[PDB]
């Protein structure tokens, strides 16, 4: 028997000039189950300035709920993206009893009112530099990078991580025309970008 809700988008963009977003949990099992939610750090072990509403309820099985996330507090910069967690957890309502209990991770992006457009719209702006053996990208927007995909001359980059606003990663090269895509704000992917070295 397990316990996972689905979500309803795979990310969530938050405007903090607003009042809050909405994100849907959808159990769709035949049993009832209990939500639990929560918003964590960028590195998913502290908790974020923000709460669910509700942050623990019973949903029955085959059906919905749509969920409000509100900024609670914090500091965020007003030019770039800040990145951060809401994860769903489905709880339970000689012998052996079982559970299987999941808690599903998605990206909160926090965009500042000044920040603009789509990430997608400027993502293609993405240098790419070799540094010693390895790929360095190099992020002049305000958006984090998510790839979706990645190549050099065709050939698969593993260790594919995000980009952070105004920041760099690294990569490994497989050894021996950089390819990319995003994926976008409705969790579909980007158009093709492609640049040199």
């Avoid at 007003?78 to 951060?84: A, C, V």
């Avoid at 909160?108 to 719209?121: E, N, Q, S, T, Y």
């Avoid at 702006?125 to 360095?136: D, F, P, S, T, Y």
């Avoid at 995000?162 to 497989?174: G, K, Q, W």
Wanted: charged share 20%; glycine share 8%.
């Amino acid at each position: 028997r397990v316990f996972s809700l689905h979500l309803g988008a795979t990310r969530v963009v938050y405007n903090p000039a607003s009042s809050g977003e909405t994100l849907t949990v959808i159990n769709d099992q035949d049993y009832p189950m209990l939500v639990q939610s929560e918003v964590l750090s960028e590195d998913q072990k502290s908790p974020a300035p923000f709460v669910v509403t509700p942050p623990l309820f019973r949903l029955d099985g085959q059906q919905s709920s749509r969920l409000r996330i509100v900024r609670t507090g914090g500091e965020f910069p007003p030019d770039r993206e800040s990145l951060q967690w809401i994860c769903v957890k489905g709880i339970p309502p000689v012998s052996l009893n079982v559970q299987l209990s999941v808690s599903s991770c998605i990206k909160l992006f926090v965009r500042p009112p000044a920040v603009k457009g789509r990430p997608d719209d400027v993502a293609g702006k993405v240098e790419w530099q070799r540094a010693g053996n390895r790929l360095k990208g190099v992020n002049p927007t305000p958006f984090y990078i998510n790839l979706s995909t990645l190549t050099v001359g065709g050939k698969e980059v593993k260790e594919r991580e995000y980009i952070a606003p105004f920041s760099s990663r690294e990569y490994p090269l497989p050894a021996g025309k950089v390819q990319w895509k995003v994926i976008t704000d409705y969790g579909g992917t980007s158009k093709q970008f492609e640049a040199e070295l």
